[PDB]
From Swiss-Prot, chain A:
Induction: Part of the metY operon that extends to pnp, also has its own promoter.
Presence of the UniProt keyword Membrane in the record: no
Keywords, ordered alphabetically: Ribonucleoprotein, Ribosomal protein, RNA-binding, rRNA-binding, Translation regulation
SMART domains named among the record's database cross-references: Ribosomal_S15 (SM01387)
Pfam families: Ribosomal_S15 (PF00312)
Domain of life: Bacteria
Subunit relationships: Part of the 30S ribosomal subunit. Forms a bridge to the 50S subunit in the 70S ribosome, contacting the 23S rRNA.
Organism of provenance: Escherichia coli (strain K12)
Full protein name: Small ribosomal subunit protein uS15
Function as written in the Swiss-Prot or TrEMBL entry: One of the primary rRNA binding proteins, it binds directly to 16S rRNA where it helps nucleate assembly of the platform of the 30S subunit by binding and bridging several RNA helices of the 16S rRNA. Binds to its own mRNA, stabilizing it 5-UTR and preventing its translation.
Family membership noted in the UniProt record: Belongs to the universal ribosomal protein uS15 family.
Taxonomic lineage from the root: Bacteria, Pseudomonadati, Pseudomonadota, Gammaproteobacteria, Enterobacterales
From Swiss-Prot, chain B:
One example GO MF annotation: mRNA 5'-UTR binding
GO CC annotation: cytoplasm; cytosol; cytosolic small ribosomal subunit
Gene3D superfamilies for this protein: Ribosomal protein S18
Protein name: Small ribosomal subunit protein bS18
Native species: Escherichia coli (strain K12)
Swiss-Prot record, chain D:
Name this polypeptide is given: Small ribosomal subunit protein bS6
Keywords in alphabetical order: Acetylation, Ribonucleoprotein, Ribosomal protein, RNA-binding, rRNA-binding
Species of provenance: Escherichia coli (strain K12)
Entry superkingdom: Bacteria
Complete-protein stretch covered: 1 to 104 of 135
Modified residues (N6-acetyllysine): K93
Gene field: rpsF
Curated annotation (Swiss-Prot), chain E:
Record carries keyword RNA-binding: yes
Keywords: Ribonucleoprotein, Ribosomal protein, RNA-binding, rRNA-binding
Gene Ontology cellular-component annotations: cytoplasm; cytosol; cytosolic small ribosomal subunit
Family: Belongs to the bacterial ribosomal protein bS21 family.
Protein name in the entry: Small ribosomal subunit protein bS21
Record's function text: Probbly involved in recognition of ribosome rescue factor SmrB in stalled/collided disomes; fusion of protein fragments to its N-terminus decreases ribosome rescue in the presence of SmrB.
GO biological process, one term: ribosomal small subunit assembly
Organism expressing this protein natively: Escherichia coli (strain K12)
Subunit and partners: Part of the 30S ribosomal subunit. In stalled ribosomes contacts ribosome rescue factor SmrB.
RNA sequence: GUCUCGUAGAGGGGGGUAGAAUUCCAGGUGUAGCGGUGAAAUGCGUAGAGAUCUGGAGGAAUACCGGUGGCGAAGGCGGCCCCCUGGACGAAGACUGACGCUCAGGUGCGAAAGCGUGGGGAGCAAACAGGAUUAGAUACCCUGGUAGUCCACGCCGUAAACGAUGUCGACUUGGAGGUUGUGCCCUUGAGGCGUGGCUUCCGGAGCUAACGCGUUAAGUCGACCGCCUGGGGAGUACGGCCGCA
RNA sequence: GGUAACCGUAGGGGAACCUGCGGUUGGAUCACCUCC
């Protein structure tokens, strides 16, 4: 995204501006990149090199969610419903 | 012998003519690196500048043109 | 007829033939000669002697216009064709500058292959 | 908003309103708060090789920090109007301002 | 190179294409093909370094 | 793994734009040949060619820089500029707290050639037509020239797709160079001490049948996956799946 | 600062193979007394 977008997004899910490393803020950042970038491939059919990065980010988000699933279901469910993630 | 590493320039410019005219042969071809001894990155930026100035018709393609 | 006195000339230097043309600066062709315009054929034409005799043969066509100074461009990679201009110099034409133009395509149309 | 470098080229007989071009273009850039760092007029100049059977034409340079929409509006204006023969647009890493060697 | 020189006539001066131009042009270009099998061509240029 | 600041780069798309050159068209000059081979011939030629000049239309790849340089998981990527965007590395500092490695099935990408529908067509060019020549042989050689090569939306999923070396870790003397970051010193102008990535070449211990590899292993170990069991028949027959073929 | 061969594929044809497009270096062959 951009520096101001990241600075405003870290506070909505993390801690006093110094954490920026928690699972919640991580998944927030990845999901922001995915939601922004989906409009790129809606027009650029032929690109296949950034698709690898897209799939890597999706896999990282999936891995983080599966870790949170075992870690604490309460924050897992809170995060998914407030972010709009199907599962 | 090199000039850019001696003078410590961070970014080499394309608008000025004096520096990059020295690094062209008489026929408009860019001089190879190993002839002049300039470092590789600065040679690359040189070539970038040659194309950039050559687009603006500040420096000729080759001496065939009148 | 019409006096030039500072004429220009073009020579073609292909592997197989040589063409010499004298120009009145602005494109205008007044006289020309070729290595094949004297019955030459085969290996007798490849050597630059054919080019030299063609060059001297152009003279009897050029001298009607009274040209003293001459300008020339050479085009073609043919072996031994650089000696042609010496013939025009010996013919009495005052050469002052010999330029060269070889058309180099900037890796454009693909070149065909010769015989194996 | 980011830095940009722009030059363009003007037909000789059409040089009489080049101040008009500078006025209109600068007004366009400042119309969206865009900031101009430098303007240079190099006057009539000879060309290395001819463009449109022309051996000379007029030169103008500027260095601005301005948003994308105004950069596109400029570039569309240059491509639409035939009074300019050539154009150039660049990005720069910082707001360079010191004296250009071209006039040194 | 525009060959304009002083008063002396026919001082040759055509010889110096060695430094200005790669001698292979118009033989590797505009006819036949080249640039294939490059590595063996480059390697021999330095394999002879010895002391 | 995440964040702050930066660096390099033919990483991938979309759109413009510039010069060089092969064609074709229009108009001047000018004459008898041009072209191609060892000769040649077919072929172009004066209701006006090539050669030269001016102008114009259209297509493809971007000379020079350009390198045993760079990027990418691989295939592969090279004029310049704008827009979108994937990945790598350096400096300190902070944060999450085992979130990891591999991967049967599965999904995606995958040079060129080849199909399906529609465009474009300069050059090149399988098949094919003509001439010629050796050698019973055509083929090689030379004129023309169709698919194709280019662009749109899909199939095909094959190569000596090779570094003939699967991915991920930790541990074991040296030497030379390249490319790209960065600390210490008054920098006593391009210079000195040190630390990181990625790369090319010698060579010790060790290993291998040998050639050789040798901190980027084919050395000493561990985790997982794929594959092999004499040569030909044969990556072939019959089936299943995939494919319009 | 000599030469080739093997791949993938498409068109043509048998002592035997050609070209069009892309790729790789694994760029070279032999070791035959009785007589034909």
């Amino acid at each position: 995204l951009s520096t101001e977008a990241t600075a405003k997004i870290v506070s909505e899910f993390g801690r006093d501006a110094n954490d920026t490393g928690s699972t919640e803020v991580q998944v927030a950042l990845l999901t922001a990149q995915i939601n922004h970038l989906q409009g790129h491939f809606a027009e650029h059919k032929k690109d296949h090199h950034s698709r690898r990065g897209l799939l890597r980010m999706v896999s990282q988000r999936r891995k983080l969610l599966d870790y949170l699933k075992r870690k604490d279901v309460a924050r897992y469910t809170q995060l998914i419903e407030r972010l709009g993630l199907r599962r | 012998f090199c000039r850019f590493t001696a003078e410590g320039v961070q970014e080499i410019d394309y608008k000025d003519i004096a520096t990059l005219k020295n690094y062209i042969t008489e026929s408009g071809k860019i001089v190879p690196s190993r002839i002049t001894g300039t470092r590789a990155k600065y040679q690359r930026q040189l070539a970038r500048a040659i194309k950039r100035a050559r687009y603006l018709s500040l420096l000729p393609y080759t001496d065939r043109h009148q | 007829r019409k006096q030039v006195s500072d004429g220009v000339a073009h020579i073609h230097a292909s592997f197989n033939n040589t063409i010499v043309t004298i120009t009145d600066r602005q494109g205008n062709a007044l006289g020309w000669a070729t290595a094949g315009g004297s019955g030459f054929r085969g290996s007798r034409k490849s050597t630059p002697f054919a080019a030299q005799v063609a060059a001297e043969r152009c003279a009897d066509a050029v001298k009607e216009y009274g040209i003293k100074n001459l300008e020339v461009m050479v085009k073609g990679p043919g072996p031994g064709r650089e000696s042609t201009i010496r013939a025009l110099n010996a013919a009495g034409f005052r050469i002052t500058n010999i330029t060269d133009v070889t058309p180099i395509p900037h890796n454009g149309c693909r070149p065909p292959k010769k015989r194996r | 908003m980011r830095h940009y470098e722009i030059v363009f080229m003007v037909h000789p007989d059409q040089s009489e309103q080049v101040p008009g071009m500078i006025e209109r273009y600068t007004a366009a850039i400042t119309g969206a708060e865009g900031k101009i760092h430098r303007l240079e007029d190099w006057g009539r100049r000879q060309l290395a090789y001819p463009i449109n059977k022309l051996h000379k034409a007029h030169y103008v340079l500027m260095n601005v920090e301005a948003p994308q929409e105004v950069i596109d509006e400029l570039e569309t204006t240059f491509r639409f109007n035939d009074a300019v023969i050539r154009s150039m647009v660049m990005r720069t890493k910082h707001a360079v301002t010191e004296a250009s060697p071209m006039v040194k | 190179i525009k060959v304009r020189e002083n008063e002396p006539f026919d001082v040759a001066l055509r010889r110096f294409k060695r430094s200005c131009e790669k001698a292979g042009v118009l033989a590797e270009v505009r006819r036949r093909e080249f640039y294939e099998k490059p590595t063996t061509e480059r390697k021999r240029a330095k394999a002879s370094a010895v002391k």
